[PDB]
Design a protein around this ligand. Structure first.
Ligand code: NA
Length: 154
């Protein structure tokens, strides 16, 4: 197939053997803010440097997928301060601010925004990736965000 490959990580539920390694307070089965055509989202109240961490040891090979993507809803406030981190060889190897990945715009409140990061361009990483995390960097409690359609893409 000439169409670029894709690998679902969360689509109304964990897919393709991805595991919930999160340490922040969150739910994988939120039904209060859900994209049309989905049934659940991941809700995450960013606080105390917690994170939603979806892992699968060496499951994302950059010889097959160039990017990690997800849809995020800023909830009541939008503009959350979050970092996206890629894990390789069981260690964090690079981070980007979500506002940066969003073209320099804080994520909009009460609406869904596509976030895309290139493994090579944004993280300078290649080879086999073990997971991705979305982490609070404020410490102080931020308004809840919702995450949906997490996918690795060629
Ligand atoms: Na909705």
């Amino acid at each position: 197939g000439a169409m670029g490959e894709s690998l679902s990580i969360y689509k109304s539920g964990l897919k393709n053997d991805f595991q919930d390694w999160s340490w922040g307070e969150h739910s994988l089965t939120d039904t209060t803010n859900v994209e049309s055509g989905e049934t659940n989202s991941i809700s995450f109240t960013p606080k105390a440097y917690g994170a939603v961490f979806l892992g699968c040891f060496e499951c994302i090979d950059t010889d097959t997928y160039n990017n990690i993507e997800f849809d995020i809803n800023g909830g009541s406030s939008g503009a959350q301060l979050l970092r996206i981190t890629v894990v390789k060889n069981s260690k964090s190897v690079g981070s980007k601010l979500i506002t940066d990945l969003n073209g320099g715009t804080p994520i909009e409140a009460n609406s869904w925004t596509k976030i895309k990061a290139s493994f090579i361009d944004d993280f300078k990483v290649s080879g086999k990736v073990d997971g991705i995390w979305i982490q609070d960097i404020k410490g102080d409690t931020q308004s809840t965000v919702y995450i949906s359609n997490i996918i690795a893409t060629a």
